[PDB]
Design a protein around this nucleic acid. Structure first.
Ligand SMILES: [Cl-]
Ligand SMILES: [Cl-]
Ligand SMILES: [K+]
Ligand SMILES: [K+]
Length: 367
RNA sequence: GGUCAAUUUGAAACAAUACAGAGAUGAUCAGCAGUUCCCCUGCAUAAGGAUGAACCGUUUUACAAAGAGAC
């Protein structure tokens, strides 16, 4: 659990003159110690400015705090540790942006100093944010107003940040190594009570899940998932791998997680030579590793005016600082190509191209 | 047609979308090992050091069917 604690390195400066931007907060405080990052924000009535400064070390911060109550051309500033001012927020809509979060707070009259979103490099689905406000009391006010708020059909979660209090995820059985997947069952074997009787001896079973539609399209091979109450039981159930059940040699293994599956689907595309498949897709690059496929979807629909039905899938390729958009057909993909190349996304200009173009652009970013 | 196979198919990824920062990761983008070059200490083609970058190996791998290509 021990990693870092920003309240030892990060200070809050209150009452800076309206002229003070990032650049010149930097210049004022950089003698205090080396600085990693500065953010600046207007007060509610635009009468003064707040700054948030992350120092490289706690002693840079303590040095900054020695300037509390000093005068910066006209104004008596206050410099303190930024402590108890961090919120954590999740279950906002998939396409919600840093700006949207900032307007959310602004509509309740709360200044936001910093809003930090996670890298999607290793998991495309991550969706949460940390948000620093200017007082403990604002933080409490945000929870009271925003926790439980319905936004575009999503019930928001907003809390005072405390990672030690985090909750169990609804899919944590799989992360703990407690869920097995059973493969190559026949339709005759794809029956809950049948699997239950055959696996109960390994340990107590918590859940059995059978993906729908396997009998109904009568598959040759069917699959199922089973969650045990503890790890050891599931590990014992792996002895059933390569064993006889009815007329089948079945397979049994610990279920994989979505990020692992999704990454391998991307790799398959990145190695395809099936030009049929490749004619249907285009890449956008370069993109921040914070940008999700939902945000890209929303861009495509709201700003480029594409219909949702024309878009089959959107996948991240953060190792080349891009994304892949698979369209309904190649003719549509070819028009979109010209339209998207040079378009604006998140206030910067993006490009579109084939996979190879995305690589060339990335390799050349390396040089 | 014997030995290596990029890959394809059987074939279905459930379980609540979110659910704790680059504070994240499973070779998921890894570990280990090697080669060349880049960067700082030096008269330097002597010896150290930290980064990189381009490469080369090796470790790993449910089952069945089919298979560009490669001895
Ligand atoms: Cl810190
Ligand atoms: Cl925290
Ligand atoms: K903290
Ligand atoms: K390797």
């Amino acid at each position: 659990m021990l990693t870092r604690n920003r309240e030892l390195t990060t200070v809050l400066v209150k009452n800076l003159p309206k002229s003070y931007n990032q650049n010149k907060v930097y210049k004022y405080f950089k003698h205090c110690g080396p600085i990693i990052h500065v953010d600046v924000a207007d007060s509610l009535k635009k009468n003064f400015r707040f700054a948030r400064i992350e120092f490289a070390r706690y002693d840079g911060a303590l040095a900054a705090i020695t300037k509390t109550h000093k005068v910066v051309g006209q104004n008596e500033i206050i410099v303190s540790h930024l402590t108890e001012c961090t919120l954590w927020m999740t279950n906002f809509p998939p396409s919600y942006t840093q700006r949207n979060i900032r307007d959310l707070l602004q509509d309740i009259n709360v200044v936001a100093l910093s809003i930090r979103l996670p890298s999607l490099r290793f998991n495309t689905s991550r969706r949460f944010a940390y948000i620093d406000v200017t007082s403990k009391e604002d933080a409490r006010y945000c929870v009271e107003k925003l926790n439980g708020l319905k936004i575009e059909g999503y019930t928001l979660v907003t809390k005072v940040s405390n990672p030690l209090e985090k909750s169990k995820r609804t899919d944590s059985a799989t992360l703990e190594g407690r869920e097995i997947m059973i493969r190559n069952l026949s339709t005759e074997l794809l029956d809950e009570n049948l699997l239950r009787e055959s696996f109960e001896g390994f340990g107590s079973i918590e859940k059995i899940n059978i993906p729908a539609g396997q009998k109904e399209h009568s598959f040759n091979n069917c699959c199922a998932f089973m969650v045990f109450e503890n790890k050891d039981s599931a590990e014992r159930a792996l002895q059933m791998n390569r064993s006889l059940l009815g007329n089948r040699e079945i397979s049994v293994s610990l279920a994989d997680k979505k990020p692992f599956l999704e990454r391998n689907e991307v790799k398959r595309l990145l190695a395809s030579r099936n030009s049929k498949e490749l004619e249907t897709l285009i890449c956008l690059f370069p993109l921040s590793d914070k940008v999700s496929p939902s945000l890209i979807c929303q861009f495509l629909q709201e700003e480029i005016h594409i219909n949702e039905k024309d878009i089959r899938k959107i996948l991240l390729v953060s190792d080349f600082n891009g994304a892949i958009i698979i369209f309904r057909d190649s003719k549509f993909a070819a028009k979109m190509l010209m339209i998207l190349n040079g378009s604006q996304f998140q206030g910067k200009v993006i490009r579109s191209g084939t996979i190879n173009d995305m690589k060339r652009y990335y390799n050349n970013q390396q040089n």
